[PDB]
A paper describes a structure:
Kinesins are a superfamily of microtubule (MT)-based molecular motors that play important roles in cellular functions such as mitosis, cell motility, and intracellular transport. The kinesin motor domain is the MT-binding engine that drives these activities, converting the chemical energy of ATP binding and hydrolysis into mechanical force.
The 3D structure of the ~72 kDa KBP at 4.6 Å resolution was determined using cryo-EM data collected using a Volta phase plate (VPP), and an atomic model was calculated. Our structure revealed that KBP is a right-handed α-solenoid protein. Nine pairs of anti-parallel α-helices (αHP1 [α-helical pair 1] to αHP9) are broken by a single ‘linker α-helix’ (LαH) and ‘linker loop’ (LL) in the centre of the fold separating KBP into N-terminal and C-terminal subdomains. The four predicted TPR motifs contribute exclusively to α-helical pairs in the N-terminal subdomain. In contrast to the shorter loops, the longer loops (more than seven residues) tend to be partially disordered, show low sequence homology between KBP orthologues in different species, and are mainly found in the N-terminal subdomain (e.g. L2, L6, and L10). In spite of this lack of consensus, density in this region suggests that part of this loop may form further α-helical structures.
Numbering used by the authors: 1 to 27, 32 to 53, 84 to 128, 134 to 176, 192 to 241, 248 to 285, 301 to 330, 392 to 527, ...
């Protein structure tokens, strides 16, 4: 009886790799266990009871890899981690192939472990050994022993980017997954381009964002081609990040018309695909960003009126979609859309006071439009307080100031209703401030303004 020759280890390699490869397809309670039983039969066939004879070293390294895949098959990886760290110690005492296989095993076990600090420390040590390899002091190859190193480099870099994005670490993780995108398109990419564009939204450089993002669009066009599509939601979030980039560029510009034209084309194609791909919550977000871009995209005086009735038609298309279901989720999104229509009525009232400042106020159709708008906004604020119990510092104070101005300037009734309405607004925020015991931001000067208003409307209508 001699030792294990090359033919026996090659037929064992072929059999084990072929059955594990046809088992990882996942076309069951025993077939995966039959692959694990064959591999533990090889484990018993090992029999452990320059350097030494390299056949034993190669077979122990590949059987440590097979023990690791058996442990990830059985989800009891403690003995697998023990055997692999002993393999790491014996390869330290005992190079390309062994260290890259040990590093892939370490990466997959510390990705299984989900402990952040140990996984990131082991990934930094494998990266340090990678930089040491870049320092640099057979029969049937895949591609010159280079394609295997290429794919495990991309896999290890994507997994360390995942461990880094489990932390905050945004700049270095973003650079690392951009390197994975470059290394992949030189030889999941939609979500990786999505988080690149989201980080660049969090950043300030948008030209490189548009460069890599249009590269993502043209490789979506030239992907080349089953059941799990996900492209609808993926480019839906891409259109979402497109309008968020439009939001931040309009915000930095406001605090020419080519932005209007690109907004027209991109949000038109976006709204077309958003009508294609569902939805309920996505459509709430759609009319949210549509109304918000209609607020931020200001042109002129007479251009404001058509834009206001445009986003009024937008919220009038929002409204009858969520009437039939009505969960408490509808109550929460009803509170958000009442805040949105409150902002829309604030913009409409700025339009109306500009019109009353520059043009004639007591005209018939203008009075009809403003009293219809006042009645609809009173109903909308009635629903907004119906979100509160009829029988956190910023939006409550903003809603109080908005309903205080609504109590103030919209009526020309018998001259006591506006006075009692501003009085109850003052007492409402007095109850708010003795209920919260906290200091406000602008409500103190709007309270002293409403107190002086209480004095002058206590004096002047009586005269």
């Amino acid at each position: 009886m001699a030792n294990v020759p090359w033919a026996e280890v090659c037929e064992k390699f072929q059999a084990a790799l072929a059955l594990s490869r046809v088992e990882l397809h996942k076309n069951p309670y025993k077939s995966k266990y039959s692959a694990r039983a064959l591999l533990e039969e090889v484990k018993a066939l090992l029999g452990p009871a320059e350097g030494p004879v390299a056949q034993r070293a190669v077979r122990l390294a590949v059987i440590e890899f097979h023990l690791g895949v058996n442990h990830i098959d059985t989800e009891e990886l403690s003995a697998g981690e023990e055997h692999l760290v002993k393999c790491l110690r014996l390869l330290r005492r005992y190079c390309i192939s062994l260290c890259i296989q040990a590093q892939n095993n370490l990466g997959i076990l510390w990705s299984e472990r989900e402990e952040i600090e140990t996984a990131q420390a082991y990934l930094e040590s494998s990266e340090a050994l990678y930089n040491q390899y870049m320092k640099e002091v057979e029969k049937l190859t895949e591609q010159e022993r280079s394609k295997r190193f290429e794919k495990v480099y991309t896999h290890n870099l994507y997994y360390l980017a995942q461990v880094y994005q489990h932390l905050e670490m945004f700049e270095k993780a973003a650079h690392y997954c951009h390197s994975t995108l470059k290394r992949q398109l030189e030889h999941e990419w939609a979500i990786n381009a999505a988080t690149l564009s989201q980080f660049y939204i969090n950043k300030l450089c948008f030209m490189e964002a548009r460069h890599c993002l249009s590269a993502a669009n043209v490789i979506f066009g030239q992907t080349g081609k089953e059941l799990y599509h996900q492209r609808k939601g993926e480019i839906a979030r891409c259109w979402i990040k497109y309008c968020l980039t439009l939001m931040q560029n309009a915000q930095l510009s406001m605090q020419a018309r080519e932005l209007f034209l690109l907004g027209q084309h991109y949000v038109f194609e976006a709204k077309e695909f958003f009508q294609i791909d569902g939805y309920v919550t996505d459509h709430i977000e759609v009319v949210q960003d549509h109304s918000a871009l209609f607020k931020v995209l200001a042109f002129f005086e007479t251009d404001m009126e058509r834009r206001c009735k445009m986003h009024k038609r937008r919220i009038a298309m929002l409204e009858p979609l969520t009437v039939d279901l009505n969960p408490q989720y509808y109550l929460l999104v009803n509170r958000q859309i009442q805040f949105e229509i409150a902002h829309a009525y604030y913009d409409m009232m700025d339009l109306k006071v500009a019109i009353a400042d520059r043009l004639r106020d007591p005209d018939s159709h203008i009075v009809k439009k403003i009293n219809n708008l006042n009645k609809s906004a009173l109903k909308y604020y009635q629903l907004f307080l119906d979100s509160l119990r009829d029988p956190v510092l910023r939006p409550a104070m903003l809603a109080k100031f908005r309903v205080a101005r609504l109590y103030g300037k919209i009526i020309t009734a018998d001259p006591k209703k506006e006075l009692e309405n501003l009085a109850t607004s003052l007492e409402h925020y007095k109850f708010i401030v003795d209920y919260c015991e906290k200091h406000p931001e602008a409500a103190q000067e709007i309270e002293v303004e409403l107190e002086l208003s209480k004095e002058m409307v206590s004096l002047l209508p009586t005269k």
